[PDB]
Design a protein around this ligand. Sequence first.
Ligand code: HEM
Ligand code: HEM
Ligand SMILES: CCCCCCCCCCCCO[C@@H]1O[C@H](CO)[C@@H](O[C@H]2O[C@H](CO)[C@@H](O)[C@H](O)[C@H]2O)[C@H](O)[C@H]1O
Ligand SMILES: CCCCCCCCCCCCO[C@@H]1O[C@H](CO)[C@@H](O[C@H]2O[C@H](CO)[C@@H](O)[C@H](O)[C@H]2O)[C@H](O)[C@H]1O
Lengths: 61, 124, 75, 438, 383, 54
Amino acid sequence: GKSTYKIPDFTPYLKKDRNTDANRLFSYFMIGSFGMLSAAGAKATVQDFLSNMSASADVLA
Amino acid sequence: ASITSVVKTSELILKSPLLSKIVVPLAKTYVKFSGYRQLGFKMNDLIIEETPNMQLALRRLPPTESYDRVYRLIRATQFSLSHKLATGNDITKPEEDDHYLIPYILDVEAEAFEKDALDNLEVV
Amino acid sequence: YVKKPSYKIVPHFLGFNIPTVSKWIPIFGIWGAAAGIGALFLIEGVPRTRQDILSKIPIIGEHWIREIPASDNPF
Amino acid sequence: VSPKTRTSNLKNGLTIASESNPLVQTATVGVWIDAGSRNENAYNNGTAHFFEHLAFKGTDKRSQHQLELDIENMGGHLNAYTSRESTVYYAKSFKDDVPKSVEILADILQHSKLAESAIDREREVITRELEEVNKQYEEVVFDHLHATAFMNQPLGRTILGPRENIQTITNTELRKFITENYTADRMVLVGAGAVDHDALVELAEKYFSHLPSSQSPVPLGTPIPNFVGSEVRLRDDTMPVAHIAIAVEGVSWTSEDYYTALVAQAIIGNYDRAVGTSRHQGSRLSNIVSENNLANSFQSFSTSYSDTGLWGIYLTSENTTQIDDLVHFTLKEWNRLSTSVSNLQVERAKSQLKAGLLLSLDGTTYVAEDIGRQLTTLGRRVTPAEVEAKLEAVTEHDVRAWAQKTLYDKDIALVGLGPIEGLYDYNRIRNDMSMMRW
Amino acid sequence: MALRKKNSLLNMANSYVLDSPQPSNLNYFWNFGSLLALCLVIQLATGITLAMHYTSHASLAFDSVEHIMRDVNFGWFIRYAHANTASFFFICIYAHMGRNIYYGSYKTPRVLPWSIGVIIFLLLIITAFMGYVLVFGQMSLWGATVICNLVSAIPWLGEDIVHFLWGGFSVGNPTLQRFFALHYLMPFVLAVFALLHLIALHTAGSSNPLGITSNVDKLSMHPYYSFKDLITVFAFLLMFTLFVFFSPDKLGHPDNYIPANPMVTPASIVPEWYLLPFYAILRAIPDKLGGVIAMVAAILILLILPIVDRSIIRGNAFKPISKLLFGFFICNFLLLGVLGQVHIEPPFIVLGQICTIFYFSYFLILLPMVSTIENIFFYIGSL
Amino acid sequence: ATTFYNVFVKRNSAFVATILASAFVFDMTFETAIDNFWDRINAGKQWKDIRHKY
Ligand code: HEM
Ligand code: HEM
Ligand SMILES: CCCCCCCCCCCCO[C@@H]1O[C@H](CO)[C@@H](O[C@H]2O[C@H](CO)[C@@H](O)[C@H](O)[C@H]2O)[C@H](O)[C@H]1O
Ligand SMILES: CCCCCCCCCCCCO[C@@H]1O[C@H](CO)[C@@H](O[C@H]2O[C@H](CO)[C@@H](O)[C@H](O)[C@H]2O)[C@H](O)[C@H]1O
């Protein structure tokens, strides 16, 4: 309301175990999973898509 | 290459009697054929200036030397675009071809190179 | 009494020295592994990759030994 | 090699510690107390600082005026300061005025009036102090830094306390505070300069013998802080200089990493454009900052408490469009404590610190402050030989291991004051706590 | 404030073509940049027009080009314009690169525009090679075959990559249709890199023939260089006219008017003239992979000029020895071109090897040595 | 958790290597899993199911 040294209430959001390795590791697991599926999705996409340039079925026949 | 390098190598040659006897006459002919004096330049006007070290050396020139350099560059640019050569007093005579900038760039580089060395010192 | 500080200049080039570079040698290793795995993953579909590299890996390698039955192959 | 610090105890458990210097003619005697604002709760926050004002407002014998006169007649001065974990009351005098000064200090600590009339008078003076700290930007920045790093915890509270408490502090709660906290087992009587130890112990037996002992005497410098990664922005476009502090949770006085954190701090070091030598310092951050005009100054710090600390940097800059570069380059220099530091930087910082820790003690007040701080945080004065050995034990592997667990990819507490539009949001600052190339 | 400065879109054009501050003493060799932009515009206009009449299928390709020549109104002009402007594009690009090397345009602070320039040159080669295949005459097919087979040299995967590029087991319809699509694309990529190298250049501005700063004496790009560019535009258009209208087939190979026949091999399979020096360098190395590496290195070695030039002075205007060396380098590059189209016979085999050594030794030995010695001569000679 | 963080996550080079290796495993195992599941839900319908008659 007036004093700027009285931090507003963040208790509804604060985690108690915020400084722990487990805490960070969980968020990096989510980031990592997302990076993993993006890598696997990119690989699948690139491989299937670029295969159009390999000899078509009529040519292989 | 650094001006420091060029100056040190030149000094090794100028020391050796044999070397100077064969190199100094070649260097003088080279300079004559180079033809920068025929556009009213001094040798140091030709040194590449788009470098931090050179920008610092140019900022340290005395104001007079700096104003005169600006005029020589403008004058040479006008000869170049006109396809003319200097005549008369615009030609740089050998006695006017002074190394006005070399001491400034050597001081700038001395500090720059000492800084690099000292950034790699190992307490013994 | 000490007259002078005691130090040497270590060899350096382009702002690198051996003490510093040596700290990064392992990191280049891991990046090399990352690049290796990534490259191999990208060409896993290439038949030669399977024939020459992937099918030779012990245990796992049988994943890449797959034959079309001759009855199902027009070519 | 400096003279040995002599240490004695009384029966109540008051420690007496002295370091004599026969080359000076002045002496600093005083009382270091292992107590401060952190010992208050939320309701009496501000009491310790309030008492400091009243300590000089008159005792049961000498009135306010008599007190003033007695000190004036001594010739030297008295001084006091209250921090979060420590309170100090000392007297600088002439050699032979030491018995007077010990007597006055003993009086103002044990026998202070705390008269309702004086409480009421100071209550306005302290209320005015709330609106004038506002000018001391470094203190504003550090107080917000503690408030956010230790959000809703005792270390997070200010020393002055809220306006509300200042209006409601009574002589009862003042008396209660100093009775609970100013006990003999928490106090050290310190003398430095022209003092005799044996004389000082006698003066202690004469004046501080009827001090209460605490019920459960813990050792000196005995304490759980839960650091909050967070930011306070106090933007003020009218100020010309930005003040920024960035810190992580640091080390306590008795951490095993205490010296490692000091060495790491010395690798970054300080910088001030106003000092002539600062453009030639070895620190990489110093070189970046000075070459690019990124800052007027920066000061690395490693503040310790009994059970936690803050390690970080305080920056001031007028370069309001390149605050981003200043913060970027600072945090990339911290990254290098994890990824790149070698024996080159570590041995250079050790050299600088071996002297620095000794150079700091250059007068009797500094010596007394050193004896008092060390006795109330560690329980003993650590000899320079021990300190030289602990510094020598710091290797480059220790620094890298410490930085990788304390700095690398960790949350920061960040405070910005002034024209800080160019300071990016929390995520972009915190993303510089690691390097994607590593 | 003038609209051309205030409006952000107009201001971008303004910064590049109108208020752009130029040195006052650029000579006519600074005109090749605008000629290259003109070639690029002509190739886009004629190329898009040919695409409206061309059929990429191998059964119809060669005949679609004959239909363009015979039936499409002004088709002959559009086709000859496109084919001859491809040669002019390379004359202008060699001139532009020769200017850059003589005047030290690759030196700091212009390393980035020069490095992007080297990629532009690689893109131009690929663009032109694919476009030449599209005719599907004898030289089209056999040139595609021999050049694409160089990829077979890549160890382990080379053969697989070739079959992947061809879309089959030899150059045929799949190859022709993919070359059409990529030939249409590559000029747009080339235009983007051409824009990138100009934006990179804009930080330092144009260099000038004296090699000194022009910050002391600037001229607006317009009207001075606009009107000076018109002279070379009209000179270019005169050369264009003489080839396109009076000798449209002088720069071509008669074998490309015979339809592709995978059975009959032409007497001599050579690239277009502008690729001939790189072909001579390839022949010089006996190993297949060695030759491919050498040939690519011959272009990528341009990237090291910023390092191997040790001069304290930018450019050759005042360096007599450097000017002699540059003259020999250029003439050697022309001789390599000639040796690219002779038969593999004595004594041209050994001569090709000697010229190839000279080509590389310019970058690796001679320029570093000569530039070092000239530094010393300038210093001692002016004391 | 500290150990896991320190080995696989702390260095980005190691984090990216772990992500890519995981993607490789995922890709191979997911392929096999879907193939089997697809064959079960479409049982008796596919050529592979009737091939034996011919
Ligand atoms: C840098 C730009 C370009 C260059 C250097 C270039 C080069 C060439 C060359 C050398 C040929 C062989 C010409 C022949 O002998 O008949 C050609 C053919 C062709 N080009 Fe381009 N080209 C470019 C841009 C374009 C563009 C943008 C298109 C748009 C489609 C295009 C479409 C064609 C077509 C359809 C042919 C085959 C018909 C023919 O041979 O004339 N070109 N190109
Ligand atoms: C499509 C091809 C290209 C176009 C349209 C083009 C256009 C231009 C233009 C308009 C300029 C400024 C005016 C001039 O100096 O002539 C220029 C400068 C330059 N270009 Fe290019 N260019 C092209 C290809 C290249 C290549 C292949 C290189 C290098 C291998 C290159 C390197 C440079 C350099 C270094 C400059 C700066 C020269 C200086 O002013 O000192 N360019 N270019
Ligand atoms: C920089 C990237 C590196 C190079 C990129 C590689 C380009 C092309 C390589 C693999 C493309 C062909 O590789 C091949 O891909 C197809 C899927 O696309 C796979 O084929 C598999 O799935 C397809 C449909 O998804 C089925 O019809 C097929 O019966 C099955 O075997 C092959 O098992 C694999 O051998
Ligand atoms: C040559 C083809 C013609 C089209 C022009 C190319 C289109 C794309 C160019 C835009 C890329 C951004 O290019 C950048 O623009 C700004 C303003 O326009 C220029 O800015 C320059 O001019 C303006 C005023 O004219 C000044 O405010 C500025 O101090 C100066 O540096 C940059 O020097 C240029 O690098």
